[PDB]
Amino acid sequence: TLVHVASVEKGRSYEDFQKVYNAIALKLREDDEYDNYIGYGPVLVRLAWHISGTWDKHDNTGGSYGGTYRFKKEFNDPSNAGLQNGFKFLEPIHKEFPWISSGDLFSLGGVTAVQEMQGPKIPWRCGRVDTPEDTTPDNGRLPDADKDAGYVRTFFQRLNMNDREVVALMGAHALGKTHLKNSGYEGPGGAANNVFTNEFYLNLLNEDWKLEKNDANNEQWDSKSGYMMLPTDYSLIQDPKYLSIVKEYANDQDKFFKDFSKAFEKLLEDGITFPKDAPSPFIFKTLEEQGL
């Protein structure tokens, strides 16, 4: 029942935020060696999700608004292991643009990464305001990966996401890789892991998956092509309701893009009250669209 009202950084408008977007995008292009040349796109998407996914609809605790990932309790959450790389990437961006709030920066990082990786446009709204250290949510609000479809479904009800929204959001798992030292899981999900596509769904349906144990003694689904799916990923083809939606996105790139864009914006905005006279959501141009 907490209320968080969006408050525009004083005097700022679209052009200010496009400059921040551009600085993130230029650094994504420049720092290309990260994670054996995957680059920082995937980890920035994951950061934006984890700072948002602490939200609880029941009392409006957590969520992106407060920028609380900057505090030790949250940045040391075992569920956030590896995200420090994303935070470090954003540090020089914040130094250049010290006026942007932490929640705005973390969420904008995710939007920028999706778009620069040739994903859908994600409308984005400013006005998250840093809140104090005692507003940092406790660890344990982000999801476990060893679980089944019923767990996933129930988990996401706390974030006010339905089946379609869950399956759309999970398509982000096309990106990057699991790293044994971070999460106890190892490997990429496909060949296209720094360009945003519907490959997650295609690979779920088309690869021959085998349930194996990794070197951390955890089960994961592996293919001979060298890809993997988490148990929670694979649950989307075990549950008949999720399976229908996986098939839809595997067969319609545009629909996946549109549904992902809506769900990801919603995820990043959960918990925030926007005044009726707040600016409309911004749609940033990519570097490519700007000739930059």
**Residues contributing to the site for ligand Cn1cccc1CN (CB under 6 A):** 173, 176-178, 188-189, 228-230, 233
Nearer to ligand HEM, 24 or 170 (CB): 170
Quick one: what does residue 120 bind among ligand Cn1cccc1CN, ligand HEM, none, with the CB cut-off 5 to 8 Å set by partner type? none
Distance of closest approach, residue 171 Cβ to ligand HEM, in angstroms = 8
Distance of closest approach, residue 15 Cβ to ligand Cn1cccc1CN, in angstroms = 34
User: Closest CB to ligand Cn1cccc1CN belongs to which residue?
Assistant: 189
Distance of closest approach, residue 221 Cβ to ligand Cn1cccc1CN, in angstroms = 8
Nearer to ligand HEM, 4 or 177 (CB): 177
Distance of closest approach, residue 266 Cβ to ligand Cn1cccc1CN, in angstroms = 20
Nearer to ligand Cn1cccc1CN, 127 or 190 (CB): 190
| Closest of 66, 32, 22, 44 to residue 264, by C-alpha | 44
What residues form DSSP beta bridges with 228? 222
Nearer to ligand HEM, 91 or 144 (CB): 144
CB atoms within 10 A of CB 55: 24
Distance of closest approach, residue 278 Cβ to ligand Cn1cccc1CN, in angstroms = 34
Nearer to ligand Cn1cccc1CN, 203 or 261 (CB): 203
- Give the interface with ligand HEM as residue ranges (CB under 6 A): 42-43, 45-46, 49, 82, 143, 145, 152, 169-170, 172-173, 175-179, 182-183, 185, 230, 232, 264
Distance of closest approach, residue 189 Cβ to ligand Cn1cccc1CN, in angstroms = 3
Query: β-strand 219-222 against 228-229: which pairing, if any?
Result: antiparallel
Q: Between the CA of residue 15 and those of 144, 218, 265, what are the distances in Å?
A: 39, 47, 20
Rg of the chain (C-alpha set): 18
DSSP codes of every residue in 88-156: HHHHHHHHH-TTS-HHHHHHHHHHHHHHHTT-----B--------GGGPPPS--SPPSS--HHHHHHHH
| Closest of 41, 18, 288 to residue 126, by C-alpha | 18
Nearer to ligand Cn1cccc1CN, 105 or 230 (CB): 230
| Surface-to-core class of residue 27, CB atoms within 10 Å of its CB (0-12 exposed, 13-18 middle, 19+ buried) | middle
